[PDB]
């Protein structure tokens, strides 16, 4: 409690055993680790062991005519089998649209004249962009950096300056934070009368949304001759999810079984993706499903749209050897392609869940 | 054939086919979870993901001290939880419920309110069938407790099941009853059609409310502890106005909650989906905590649906889950949910205190 944060992992475990907080078999199991103790102990604080999540391979996924082998880390049975089944039925997925910009905000408070403050800033945008480069030049040399500023006001007392930043293949926490912390020091020289509450990245990556679709002949749905009937019930089930939040949450949870499994296997931040995806499910003031299914002629059409600010470098994507091994199997080129594969996984998982759900 | 292969044949096939390098194969083979367990929990298993697990410190809930196992790949999370709990000193339970939710959904219903009327006069037979489908839970003092009915779109009827599943998450119990009762509905109403009968992950009857009261002097090592308290109340209030902050505000909460959920072998997707959906109040995605200033004491409160488990799923089959359970030493799932919700509030306190102290 006092020296635990300075203790070595071996001293921590011995301390817990000696104080009776763990048994001898518990200590032996905590010591049964495959991630290097020097890596683990430097990644987090008070480190003592690791959690092991089985990792399997999702099969038959094809996105934009390209085959993939999807690494999926999950503790839940049938998740990988369902992804492989839905992907085989869909045959292929196609990209509809995609953007990739990370969001940040500098928030003012006790603003007497909100509309006038944003007008002061809108004319000096060229100098805000220049201060952004100075606060983080590396990303600008890599070909990214601030791409757009936006302005919003709330409760007649808050003013949010939004930053849309190209963070390239990283998630962008350090880029955006440092960039906005420097641009905030400039905001304070310009307007000493105004006050800043905080300057931080936003995980609601509405400018990293990917939209994927699939078009399935109803014949492919069932090996029998009931495919059209199964398609109609899939459309109804998907429609019902956007009517009843108690189904929407389960509907989207099923999607995240696949999405989070790839996110985890590749060393990405699972809380960030879950937060942004579930928040994005809130449309028209209501929590709805993240996918849509419609019947057009003899073809079942599915579509998904999710904010996926994923990373192929930084964070835990490289420091953890298993992240790199998973990336070798997946063989994506950049983060944009990762988001496309992950979105297609979500839609494939949704197809398998719905088909199994309504086939009675 | 990949599905039928052993884990070793799979890795050999991936290398021989040119999909992974020899270095990657060797890293996939560096595993600590027994191959027999991993290969039986999931499909197409090849390896595992290792997430560093540490110990959150200084957490006190209802005058009981805990050592919190936390599995995360993000630095500073475990340290921030320990610090937030240290400042908090203690956490008190406000209210708690623990019932799991299921639903049988009819479609193409000519008169939803008329079908509901016919159902409400057969509840004794439904309850009787629910027990016959899964008698074990009834003997251990649980089982179906309530039935509710909702109509949607003038064509759907949802029969809602509220079930006491004791220390399990409850998928097998709930789905067993729903299947049995659904077959009864098909005999009773041959003209009606059932779309699906499945567990719902939106556990609104498993919500836990936790609170804390901190003298403002504890927020700062200096003398502006009441200032930092005022700015924490502003940052929290702002989350209830701007969704781009509410997602980040709640993401920070889940850094703690998901870390414990993962360490204890619980379903991370289920908790994430239910918590983020529960954040939608008044048609707006808002924060899951509230912070207010009452004199010289900062008051924090959290309210989250936590249908967590101490048995079933992966809470025991994964040896690290049992080890984590030993460290935390919780008697039942209800207690687990109280501890995890307190972890969420402490993590939020540490994040908000740091967010505003930077702006000063
Ligand atoms: Ca602009
Ligand atoms: Ca490869
Ligand atoms: Ca590529
Ligand atoms: Ca009635
Ligand atoms: Ca113990």
The two counts, helices (H) then strands (E), for chain A are 13, 14
Question: CA-CA distances (angstroms) from residue A351 to A30, A80, A231, B286?
Answer: 39, 13, 10, 30
The C-alpha torsion from A52 through A53 and A56 to A62, rounded to 10°, is -130
Which three-class secondary structure string do you get for B36-51?
Answer: HHHHHHCCCEEEEEEE
Q: Nearest to residue B191, comparing CAs of B256, B274, B295, B114?
A: B114
Ligand nearest to the CA of B151: 4
Q: Which of A21, A50, A250 sits opposite B200 (nearest CB)?
A: A250
- Cβ neighbors of B312 (< 8 A, separation 6 or more) are B167, B168, B169, B172
Question: Taking ligand 4, which is a single-atom ion, which protein residues have CB atoms under 5 Å away?
Answer: B 117
Q: Which chain B residue has its CA at the smallest distance from A235's CA?
A: B195
Across the interface, whether the CB atoms of B54 and A48 are under 8 A apart is answered yes
Give chain A's largest Cα–Cα span.
73
Chain A residues touching B260 at Cβ < 8 A: none
**Three-state DSSP class for residue A27:** helix
3-class SS of residue A70: strand
The coordinates were experimentally obtained by: X-ray
A95: three-class secondary structure by DSSP? strand
| Chain A residue nearest residue B58, CA to CA | A1
Ligand 5 centroid distance, CA of A48 (Å): 15
Give the distance (Å) from ligand 2 centre to CA of residue A266. 13
Nearest by Cα to A61 from A251, A170, A212, A227:
A212
Give the burial string for A127-146 (b: 16+ CB within 10 Å, else e): ebbebbeebbeebbeeebbb
Q: Which ligand is nearest to the CA of A326?
A: 2
Burial class (CB in 10 A: 0-12, 13-18, 19+), A109: buried
Instruction: Report CA dihedral (A281, A287, A292, A295) to the nearest 10 degrees.
Output: -170
CB nearest B75 (choices: A1, A29, A44): A44
**CB-CB neighbours of B323 under 10 Å:** 26
User: Cβ of A77 and B42 within 8 Å?
Assistant: yes
Q: Are A89 and A221 in contact (CB under 8 A)?
A: yes
CA distance, residue A96 to nearest chain B CA (Å): 25
B108 to B16, B104, B105, B151, B341: CA distances (angstroms): 53, 14, 10, 12, 41
Phi-psi region of B334 (alpha: psi -120 to 50; beta: other; left: phi over 0): alpha
* CA–CA gap between residue B94 and residue B338 (Å, rounded): 10
Closest ligand (CA of A23): 5
CB-nearest partner of A154 from B2, B33, B241: B241
> Ligand 3 centre and the CA of A68: distance in Å?
10
Any idea which residue has 């408070």 for tokens?
A: A109
Which tokens hold the place of A144?
């990214």
Structure-block tokens of residue A147 = 């791409």
- The residue written with tokens 């007497």 in the block is A112
Task: Name the nearest CA neighbour of A150 among A96, A106, A113, A108.
Answer: A106
Q: In what order do the strands lie in the sheet with B143-152?
A: B143-152, B156-164, B100-107, B193-200
Beta bridge pairs of residue A302: A214, A293
Q: Quote the DSSP letter at residue A194.
A: S
Chain A residues close to B73, C-beta within 8 Å = 43-44, 267, 269, 315-316, 320
Decide if A59 and B75 are in contact by the 8 Å CB cutoff.
Answer: no
Cβ-in-10-Å burial (0-12, 13-18, 19+) of A308 comes to buried
Residues B332 and B310 sit within 8 Å (Cβ to Cβ):
yes
Nearest residue of chain A to residue B23 (CA atoms)? A325
Contacts of B245 in chain A (CB under 8 A): 105, 107, 202
CA distances in angstroms from A323 to A88, A193, A277, B53, B98, listed in the order given: 26, 48, 22, 16, 37
Q: Cα A32 to the chain's mean position, in Å?
A: 30
Give B262's contacts (C-beta < 8 A, 6+ positions apart): A51, A53, B51, B71, B72, B268
Residues near B266 by Cβ (< 8 Å), separated by ≥ 6? B169, B308, B309, B313, B314, B315
Question: What one-character DSSP code corresponds to residue A93?
Answer: B
DSSP A243: T
Backbone angles phi, psi at B318, to 5 degrees: -90, 115
Residue A342 and residue A257 in contact, taking contact as beta carbons nearer than 8 Å: no
> How far is Cα B158 from Cα B40, in angstroms, rounded to an integer?
35
What region, left, alpha or beta, does residue A164 occupy, with left being phi > 0 and alpha being psi -120 to 50 degrees?
beta
Rounded Cα distance between A286 and B277, Å, is 9
Residue among B50, B327, B162, B227 nearest A46 (CA): B327
Beta-carbon separation of A46 and B38 below 8 A: no
Spatial separation of the C-alpha atoms in residues A60 and A68, rounded to whole Å: 7
Residue A168 CA to residue A140 CA, distance in Å, equals 10
A47 is in an annotated binding site: no
Residue B337: exposure state from Cβ atoms within 10 A (0-12, 13-18, ≥19): buried
Cα atoms in the Cβ-side hemisphere of radius 13 Å centred on B12 = 6
The three-state DSSP-derived secondary structure of chain B is CCCCCCHHHHHHHHHHCCCCCHHHHHHHCCCCCCHHHHHHHCCCEEEEEEEEEEEEEEEEECCEEEEEEEECCCCCHHHHHHHHHHHHCCEEEEEECCCEEEEEEEECCCCHHHHHHHHHCCHHHHHHHHHHHCHHHHHCCCEEEEEEEEEECCCEEEEEEEEECCCECCHHHHHHHHHHHHHHHHHHCCCCEEEEEEEECCCHHHEEEEEEEEEHHHHCCCCCHHHHHHHHHHHHHHHCCCHHHHHHHHHHHHHHHHHHHHHCCCCHHHHHHHHHHHCEECCEECCCEEEEEECCEEEEEEEEECCCCCECCCCCCCHHHHHHHHHHCCCCHHHHHHHHHHHHHHHHHHHHHHHHHHHC
CA B43 to ligand 3 center in whole angstroms = 26
Interatomic CA distance for residues B213 and B349, integer angstroms: 11
User: Distance (Å, rounded) from C-alpha B118 to C-alpha B126?
Assistant: 12
Q: How far apart are CA A216 and CA B207, in angstroms?
A: 40
Residues 6+ apart with CB under 8 A from B258: A270, A271, A274, B72, B268, B271, B272
CB B58 within 8 A of CB B85: yes
Output the DSSP codes for A15-26.
HHHHTTSS-HHH
Contacts of A40 in chain B (CB under 8 A): 50, 52
Secondary structure letter of residue A220 according to DSSP: G
The H or E element spanning position A162 is strand A158-166
Binding residue per annotation — B146?
A: yes
DSSP structure class, residue A76? S
| Ligand 3 midpoint to CA B213 (Å) | 53
Indicate which of A27, A40, A45, A272 best probes the interface with B, i.e. most B CBs within 10 Å of its own CB: A45
Q: How far from chain centre, in Å, is Cα A156?
A: 32
Determine phi and psi for A191, rounding to 5 degrees: -125, 85
Give distance in angstroms: CA of B115 to centre of ligand 4. 9
Nearest-Cα distance to chain A for B246, in Å, is: 9
Q: What is the DSSP letter of A179?
A: H
Instruction: Tokens 């998450």: give the residue.
Output: B169
Q: Look at A103 and B73 and tell me if their CB atoms are within 8 Å.
A: no
B89: left (phi over 0), alpha (psi -120 to 50) or beta: left
Helix (H) or strand (E) holding A126: helix A125-135
From the list A33, A95, A91, A37, the residue with the least C-alpha distance to A64 is: A95
- State the distance from the centre of ligand 1 to the C-alpha of B43, rounded, in angstroms: 48
Secondary structure of residue A357 in the 3-state scheme: helix
**How many residue pairs from chains A and B have C-beta atoms closer than 8 A?**
363
Indicate the SS3 state at residue A288.
coil
Give the angle A346-B3-A76 at the CA atoms, nearest 5°: 45
């Amino acid at each position: 409690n006092s020296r635990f944060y300075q203790m070595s992992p071996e001293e921590r475990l011995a301390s817990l055993l000696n104080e009776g907080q763990i048994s001898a078999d518990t200590k032996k199991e905590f010591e049964n680790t495959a991630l290097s103790s020097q890596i683990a102990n430097h990644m987090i604080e008070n480190q003592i062991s690791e959690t092991e999540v089985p990792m399997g391979v999702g099969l038959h996924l094809t996105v934009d005519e390209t085959d993939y082998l999807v690494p999926m880390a999950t503790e839940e049975p049938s998740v990988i089998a369902a992804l492989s089944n839905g992907a085989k039925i869909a045959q292929g997925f196609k990209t509809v649209n995609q953007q990739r910009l990370m969001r940040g905000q500098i928030v003012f408070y006790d603003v007497a004249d909100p509309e006038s403050l944003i007008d002061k800033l809108q004319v000096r945008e060229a100098e805000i962009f220049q201060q952004a480069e100075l606060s983080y030049p590396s990303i600008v040399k890599r070909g990214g950096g601030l791409r757009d500023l936006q302005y919003r006001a709330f409760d007649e007392s808050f003013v949010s300056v939004d930053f849309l930043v190209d963070v390239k293949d990283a998630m962008g926490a350090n880029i955006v934070n440092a960039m906005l912390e420097g641009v905030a020091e400039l905001f304070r020289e310009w307007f000493a009368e105004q006050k800043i509450l905080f300057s931080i990245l936003s995980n609601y990556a509405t400018e990293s949304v990917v939209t994927m679709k699939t078009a399935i002949p109803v014949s492919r749905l069932s090996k029998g001759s009931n495919g059209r009937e199964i398609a109609e019930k899939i459309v109804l089930a998907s429609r019902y999810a956007s009517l009843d939040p108690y189904r929407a949450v389960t509907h989207n949870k099923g999607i995240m079984n696949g999405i989070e499994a790839v996110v985890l296997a590749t060393g990405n931040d699972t809380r960030a993706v879950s937060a942004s995806c579930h928040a994005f499910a809130v449309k028209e003031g209501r929590y709805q499903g993240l996918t849509s299914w419609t019947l057009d002629g003899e073809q079942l059409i599915g579509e998904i749209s999710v904010p996926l600010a994923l990373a192929t470098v930084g964070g835990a994507t490289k420091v953890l050897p298993k992240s790199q091994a998973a990336a070798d199997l997946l063989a994506v080129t950049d983060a944009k392609e990762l988001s496309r594969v992950v979105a297609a996984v979500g839609l494939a998982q949704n197809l398998a869940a719905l088909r199994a759900l309504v086939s009675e």
